[PDB]
């Protein structure tokens, strides 16, 4: 617990990168977050939206 | 560009479509700028 300042910096970098990767799984209103699903589920006009 | 199709096929005459006519006869590009004009000519038959 003495090194709390340095371990906090390492934790915040890991937390930020894990959050950035976890956000690839999110839909944002899209029919799937897996991009190859969208390109195989739909016709090109709907897929681009 | 002008031609005659069955009435059910007219839906395929739009940018980025798929189907027999859009695959094998007349394809519009995805960035098409233009108008598609169509009417029944059933009185000619």
Curated annotation (Swiss-Prot), chain B:
Domain of life: Viruses
Annotated region (Integrin-binding motif), positions in chain: 6-8
Subunit relationships: Binds to host ACE2. RBD also interacts with the N-linked glycan on 'Asn-90' of ACE2. Cleavage of S generates a polybasic C-terminal sequence on S1 that binds to host Neuropilin-1 (NRP1) and Neuropilin-2 (NRP2) receptors. Interacts with host integrin alpha-5/beta-1 (ITGA5:ITGB1) and with ACE2 in complex with integrin alpha-5/beta-1 (ITGA5:ITGB1). May interact via cytoplasmic c-terminus with M protein. May interact (via N-terminus) with host bilirubin and biliverdin, thereby preventing antibody binding to the SARS-CoV-2 spike NTD via an allosteric mechanism.
Primary role: Attaches the virion to the cell membrane by interacting with host receptor, initiating the infection. The major receptor is host ACE2. When S2/S2' has been cleaved, binding to the receptor triggers direct fusion at the cell membrane. When S2/S2' has not been cleaved, binding to the receptor results in internalization of the virus by endocytosis using host TFRC and GRM2 and leading to fusion of the virion membrane with the host endosomal membrane. Alternatively, may use NRP1/NRP2 and integrin as entry receptors.
Protein name in the entry: Spike protein S1
Native source species: Severe acute respiratory syndrome coronavirus 2
Classification of source organism: Viruses, Riboviria, Orthornavirae, Pisuviricota, Pisoniviricetes
Gene: S
């Amino acid at each position: 617990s003495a090194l709390g300042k340095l371990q906090d910096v390492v934790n915040q970098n890991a937390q930020a990168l894990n959050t950035l990767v976890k956000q690839l799984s999110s839909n944002f209103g899209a029919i799937s977050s897996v991009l190859n699903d969208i390109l195989s589920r739909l016709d090109k006009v709907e897929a681009e939206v | 560009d002008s031609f005659v199709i069955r009435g059910d096929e007219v839906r395929q005459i739009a940018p980025g479509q798929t189907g027999k006519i859009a695959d094998y006869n007349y394809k519009l590009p995805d960035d098409f700028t233009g108008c598609v004009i169509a009417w029944n000519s059933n009185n000619l038959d």
